[PDB]
Curated annotation (Swiss-Prot), chain A:
Motif MREI motif per UniProt: ranges: 1-4
Modified residues (Phosphoserine): S172
Listed GO CC annotations: axonemal microtubule; intercellular bridge; mitotic spindle; myelin sheath; sperm flagellum; tubulin complex
Subunit structure comment from the entry: Dimer of alpha and beta chains. A typical microtubule is a hollow water-filled tube with an outer diameter of 25 nm and an inner diameter of 15 nM. Alpha-beta heterodimers associate head-to-tail to form protofilaments running lengthwise along the microtubule wall with the beta-tubulin subunit facing the microtubule plus end conferring a structural polarity. Microtubules usually have 13 protofilaments but different protofilament numbers can be found in some organisms and specialized cells. Component of sperm flagellar doublet microtubules.
Family according to the record: Belongs to the tubulin family.
Protein name as catalogued: Tubulin beta-4B chain
N6-acetyllysine: modified positions: K58
PANTHER family: TUBULIN
From Swiss-Prot, chain B:
Origin: domain of life: Eukaryota
Effect of loss of the gene: MNS1-deficient mice display situs inversus and hydrocephalus. They are sterile, exhibit a sharp reduction in sperm production, and remnant spermatozoa are immotile with abnormal short tails.
Cystine residue pairs: none
Organism, as annotated: Mus musculus
Family assignment from sequence similarity: Belongs to the MNS1 family.
Subunit structure: Able to form oligomers. Microtubule inner protein component of sperm flagellar doublet microtubules. Interacts with ODAD1. Interacts with BBOF1.
Entry protein name: Meiosis-specific nuclear structural protein 1
Annotated compartments: Nucleus; Cytoplasm, Cytoskeleton, Flagellum axoneme; Cytoplasm, Cytoskeleton, Cilium axoneme
Function per UniProt: Microtubule inner protein (MIP) part of the dynein-decorated doublet microtubules (DMTs) in cilia axoneme, which is required for motile cilia beating. May play a role in the control of meiotic division and germ cell differentiation through regulation of pairing and recombination during meiosis. Required for sperm flagella assembly. May play a role in the assembly and function of the outer dynein arm-docking complex (ODA-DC). ODA-DC mediates outer dynein arms (ODA) binding onto the axonemal doublet microtubules.
Span within the parent record: 100 to 148 of 491
Gene it is expressed from: Mns1
Tissue specificity remark: High expression in testis. Expressed in pachytene spermatocytes and post-meiotic spermatids.
From Swiss-Prot, chain D:
Modified residues (3'-nitrotyrosine): Y282
Protein name: Tubulin alpha-1A chain
GO molecular function: GTP binding; hydrolase activity; identical protein binding; metal ion binding; protein heterodimerization activity; protein-containing complex binding; structural constituent of cytoskeleton
Binding residue positions for GTP: 10-12, 15, 71, 99, 140, 143-146, 179, 183, 206, 224, 228, 252
Known role: Tubulin is the major constituent of microtubules, protein filaments consisting of alpha- and beta-tubulin heterodimers. Microtubules grow by the addition of GTP-tubulin dimers to the microtubule end, where a stabilizing cap forms. Below the cap, tubulin dimers are in GDP-bound state, owing to GTPase activity of alpha-tubulin.
Gene of this entry: Tuba1a
SUPFAM superfamilies named among the record's database cross-references: Tubulin C-terminal domain-like (SSF55307), Tubulin nucleotide-binding domain-like (SSF52490)
């Protein structure tokens, strides 16, 4: 029926991806050897959305895990759920980019992308009525953001009609883990404006905020942080895999959301989040997750929405719940103030309620907000890109593979009309 | 009795030639014996010198 | 039957090849048929 | 399958690999006989040794290294030592007649009989590679083979191989206490044949390691065996990310594009922060933040050069042990916002962080202790232009009265080659001064 | 029933045959005095439990046969087989042809008759000789001519030591070498050759052995002959019969002189560190060092190349490494031989002699080349003969013992025709 092909790129992508497939498989009753051990009748019918149908009652995913370096996928051949992938799907190379977006776009990326793209059609040929794709990124690198931009445009030219989601992890601006990344995030956003039908941005600095102040962890590994993204990754697609008394699939949440087709950088969040002690003391009602899905502390990107207005706002909810009480508490959010809210679009709210929550909570909520206060995320990278580029710092590495001086300025001019395309609606 | 003997032997032979853990096993054994002989002969020629 | 034949061939040929073996000749603890001295090694 | 070819040269290169390869036989389970022992030879689940060690069909591991010098008395302590039967005997190249502390003797006269021979044993070692990550030259700016023949290898490796990484480890002659008199004629004449044909070259004084040993390791009168354990720990920590998996895995090809702003500024200096004598490791906590604050000190460098008189172009911090990366990123924000640690105003990002899981090991007899985590900083600061204002003056006084030049012009060298390689460092003393200047 | 009869003539012949028959006796399980505590290719069997070689030994100086007749192989042979003359041939082609050999050619041919009536499926003879001496030229010429006009079209293979450029012990060695090449140009099916100077260089270089004796050469020639004739005794993936070389190697009936080598000649102290795979040894066959006859390889182009592999070898490794050799276009193969090679494989690996120096290697190759390079050796071997025969040095003994002055001249022209024939089949 309506099926999803999954794509995972870069070292951050495979770390995100291996944690993502656990929270789908344990939802769907699948053991690490891939044999169905579930309990409910409704569990199994939409296994064709993500998984194939192997012999003897076995299920395998439909992910292809591209990486330049083989030193990350040997981890996920030994992972806790790292066995169920088909070994044809692992695609790997010999020479890594090494955080050079020129080398991850031109030199060995052109040599390798054939081997991925033959596997791409193979997991697309088994589809009946394919619905879209999915991608995982971190924008700061040359191996995942570098391969990813060439992995987006080459899939647009063959399947241009399908709703092609693509995640992103925008780099942390306060302290970066790389020094060459203002060339790398700015060269990738220009390719990410034009081609992707839907994107989300994730400040991993706010993930360090959201485990410290709210979740009260002491030792947050990246693997535990990729749990938090994995709730949102399964949170949006929950109408394609399950029943609904008010449903919203991927296509009903994009074309109901995006006003102008260069404006698809969103800011997500997850509302029922507590420490293990603090879960007991705090109620589980309908407004108490409306308190927290819009709560500026509990956001996921580090762009506070008191720097502008919300164009359109979404919240997919999970579990059986009443619909007066989700409406009157969404009526109240638009009406308690008119400053952070847009005049020329009369409403903002998107609502969706499924019937099966994630296991462990009676209620759940996943937030999507399309804000005008994301423009400072770009004037921050615009000034860091033009600090390096005046004296041409580090540029002698990017030039030597087939890039000239003009390829930064057009990727900065397009990067600098994006703030004004945001500033005009913001004022 | 004749049946017993013939069937048993044929089984053993063909089934060995066909399985596989055995292929790796044989390569390992042959290489080991060979290198053992090599070291022994090295020691022998040293003693001869 | 192929696993039983593999045990027969191991316990016939590999008895005296004690001090060294290649990497893939032993899997999932086949020493119990040759119990006597392989364990103490 | 990833690989390195650790090619040494010089009498101060064989004495480094003696203490370098004994570390890599301890990281793995390898005996000095070469064969793996009984416990690890039945499962065989570990294939982490393929970066450095080969593997023959009869179960013996032979490392990938060739030892070069013209002095036949420091290789002949390897063919009778503990490591007699580890190394393949065709990889210990050794010349009869010496080099005798002349650059020109080791570039034109003697070294031409071995430039062909060592480039056949190199071609064996680099032929098993599915993928070569990079070579590792260990040489010295002191004398004939370590400075002359190294320049002859650089002009023939890159012509042979080309766009392939070749890291370099090198001592640097001390400010005051050095052991030669013809020495500044060499260190000006080996930088000039390395400005083009080496992708990265680390800088170490042996004088600054003489200062850290009276200070940190609490050892009085250190010998030369205790200088090659510290350098041998760094070259473990650079290449540990190839062999053992990590959370932020940083290869060799990652470095050479991530440290150099301009293509003749490839001279980064390095340090190893948690060097503690085993008495004081019992007294001092060694967290992840406080061994990041202890690289930028005025005392834990390895080149006698205090970077207070310079602006940091970039850093490349590599971590090893048990670290969690919330607590790494808390400390790098401290060092950027601290006032004294100067950063160049065309680098607002600055850093490069790497994480690996293996804790550092302990060699028996090593003065270092077992510490749970350890870092290794790599920076190319502006302050290194001070140190050339010391060596290039010492070339100028001797060349003014034309001292010591008559051995060089008679040993197959023209007198003009001192003039063109003197004007060449009259650019690099300026080339640091144009990029340390604030923006206009 | 692939029986071959071996005759060793010349001191080079019997001193090679000592090493050859100790190698063949250790090849099977035969203890050396004859008994045993597939072998019917070289040994007849008597019902007491005794094995008799198919070998005839002959020289005209009694001491070199008598040391065999007294030494440790005294009970191997029927002791009438060790034929012995009275007066030495005295390095004289006329004496070993016309005058002295007329007493013993009848005896050796009658014992050849009795052995060929003992045999039942006869295939060929192995005549071991040199190009240096009187009984290594004249008696071998009479033996080959009489066996050709007596037995028919059966493969009389001959093995020849070859006179090196700067290495000789005689003075008159061009004279009797050009004479034996003239009169044995026609009735030998093939003539393998080896150069003592090239074996000296290989013994210095590959085997790390200084100052070699003659036993250290005859062991190598024994390994060569056993790798030739392993196919008749032991069965393999692709056997090659001994007749197949006649239709395989030689293109025209004066070009039956192929060269040989054997690639894993390596001592134990280096072969312990080095692995020697199939691609390694077949690439190593084609060095100018590791050949066994001194001719400059690069000045000649190849005609045909018959490889014999021995031991554990998988045929795709061979079939890939052959094309890998072919495509280089510096190993010049002639433009009327697109087939190039001819390959055989046998299972049983090369064996080891007690008191030996070649390391026990699992697989080995013996390659039989047919080059154009040996025109330089024929040019120089005609030139030395031309230098001496300008003023009639050493001729008066041979003309007092049986040829006129013109027969040296007609042998000169009948040998120079061959040097023109290479330029014919080269251009």
């Amino acid at each position: 029926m309506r099926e999803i092909v999954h794509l995972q790129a870069g070292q951050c992508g495979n770390q995100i991806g291996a944690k993502f497939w656990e929270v789908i498989s344990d939802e769907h009753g699948i053991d690490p050897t891939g044999t169905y051990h579930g309990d409910s009748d409704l569990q199994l019918e939409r296994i064709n959305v993500y998984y194939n149908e192997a012999t003897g009652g076995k299920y395998v995913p439909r992910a292809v895990l591209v990486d330049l370096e083989p030193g990350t996928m040997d981890s996920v051949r030994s992972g806790p759920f790292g066995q169920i992938f088909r070994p044809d799907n692992f695609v790997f190379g010999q020479s890594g980019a090494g955080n050079n977006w020129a080398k991850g776009h031109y030199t060995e990326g052109a040599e390798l992308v054939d081997s991925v793209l033959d596997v791409v059609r193979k997991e697309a040929e088994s589809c009946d009525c394919l619905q879209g794709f999915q991608l995982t990124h971190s924008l700061g690198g040359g191996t995942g953001s570098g391969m990813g931009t060439l992995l987006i445009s080459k899939i647009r030219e063959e399947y241009p009609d399908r709703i092609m989601n693509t995640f992103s992890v925008v780099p942390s601006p306060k302290v970066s883990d790389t020094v060459v990344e203002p060339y790398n995030a700015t060269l990738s956003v220009h390719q990410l404006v034009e081609n992707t039908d839907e994107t989300y941005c994730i400040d991993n600095e706010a993930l360090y905020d959201i485990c410290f102040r709210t979740l009260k962890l002491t030792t947050p590994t990246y693997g535990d942080l990729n749990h938090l993204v994995s709730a949102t990754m399964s949170g949006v697609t929950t109408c394609l895999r399950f029943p609904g008394q008010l449903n919203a699939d991927l296509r009903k949440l994009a074309v109901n959301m995006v006003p102008f087709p260069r404006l698809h950088f969103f800011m997500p969040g997850f509302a029922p989040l507590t420490s293990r002690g603090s879960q007991q003391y705090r109620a589980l009602t309908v407004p108490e997750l409306t308190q927290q899905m819009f709560d500026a502390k509990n956001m996921m990107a580090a762009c506070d929405p008191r720097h502008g207005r919300y164009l359109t706002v979404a919240a997919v909810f999970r579990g059986r719940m009443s619909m007066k009480e989700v409406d009157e508490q969404m009526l109240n959010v638009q009406n308690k103030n008119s400053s952070y809210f847009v005049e020329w679009i009369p409403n903002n709210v998107k609502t969706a309620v499924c019937d099966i929550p994630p296991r462990g909570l009676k209620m759940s909520a996943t937030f999507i907000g399309n804000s005008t206060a994301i423009q400072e995320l770009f004037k921050r990278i615009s000034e860091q890109f033009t600090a390096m580029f005046r004296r041409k710092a580090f540029l002698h590495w990017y030039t030597g593979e087939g890039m000239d001086e003009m390829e930064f300025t057009e990727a900065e001019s397009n990067m600098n009309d994006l703030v004004s395309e945001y500033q005009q609606y913001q004022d | 009795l004749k049946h017993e003997s013939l069937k048993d032997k044929k089984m053993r032979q063909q089934v060995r030639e066909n399985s596989i853990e055995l292929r790796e096993l044989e390569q390992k054994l042959k290489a080991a014996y060979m290198n053992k002989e090599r070291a022994a002969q090295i020691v022998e020629k040293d003693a001869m010198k | 039957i192929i696993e039983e034949e593999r045990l027969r061939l191991l316990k016939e040929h590999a008895a005296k090849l004690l001090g060294y073996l290649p990497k893939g000749v032993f899997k999932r603890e086949d020493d119990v048929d040759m119990l006597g001295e392989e364990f103490r090694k | 399958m990833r690989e390195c070819i650790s090619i040494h040269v010089g009498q101060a290169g064989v004495q480094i690999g003696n203490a370098c390869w004994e570390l890599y036989c301890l990281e793995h389970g390898i005996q000095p006989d070469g064969q793996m022992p009984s416990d690890k030879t039945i499962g065989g689940g570990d294939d982490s040794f393929n970066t450095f060690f080969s593997e023959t069909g009869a179960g013996k591991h032979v490392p990938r290294a060739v030892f070069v010098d013209l002095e036949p008395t420091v290789i002949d302590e390897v063919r009778t030592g503990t490591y007699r039967q580890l190394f393949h005997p065709e990889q210990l190249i050794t010349g009869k007649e010496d080099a005798a502390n002349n650059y020109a003797r080791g570039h034109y006269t003697i070294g031409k009989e071995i430039i062909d021979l060592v480039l056949d044993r190199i071609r064996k070692l680099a032929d098993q590679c599915t993928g070569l990550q990079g070579f590792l030259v260990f040489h010295s700016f002191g004398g004939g083979t370590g400075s002359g023949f190294t320049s002859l290898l650089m002009e023939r490796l890159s012509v042979d191989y080309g766009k392939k990484s070749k890291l370099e480890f090198s001592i640097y002659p001390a400010p005051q206490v050095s052991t030669a008199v013809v020495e500044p004629y060499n260190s000006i004449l080996t930088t000039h044949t390395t400005l083009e044909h080496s992708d990265c070259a680390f800088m170490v004084d042996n004088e600054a390691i003489y200062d850290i040993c009276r200070r940190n390791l609490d050892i009085e009168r250190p010998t030369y065996t205790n200088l090659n354990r510290l350098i041998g720990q760094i070259v473990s920590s650079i290449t540990a990310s190839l062999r053992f998996d990590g959370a932020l895995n940083v290869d060799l090809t990652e470095f050479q594009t991530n440290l150099v702003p301009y293509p003749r500024i490839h001279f980064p200096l390095a340090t190893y922060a948690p060097v503690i004598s085993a008495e004081k490791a019992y007294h001092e906590q060694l967290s992840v933040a406080e061994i990041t604050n202890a690289c930028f000190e005025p005392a834990n460098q390895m080149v006698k050069c205090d970077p207070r008189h310079g602006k940091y172009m970039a850093c490349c911090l590599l971590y090893r042990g048990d670290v969690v990366p919330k607590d790494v990123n808390a400390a790098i924000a401290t060092i950027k916002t601290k006032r004294t640690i100067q950063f160049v105003d065309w680098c607002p990002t600055g850093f490069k962080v790497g994480i690996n899981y293996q804790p550092p090991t302990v060699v028996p007899g090593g003065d270092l202790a077992k510490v749970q985590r350890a870092v290794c900083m790599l920076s190319n600061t502006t302050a290194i232009a001070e140190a050339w204002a010391r060596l290039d003056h010492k070339f100028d006084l001797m060349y003014a009265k034309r001292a010591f030049v008559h051995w060089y012009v008679g040993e197959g060298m023209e007198e003009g080659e001192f003039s063109e390689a003197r004007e060449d460092m009259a650019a690099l003393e300026k080339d640091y001064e144009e990029v340390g200047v604030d923006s206009v």
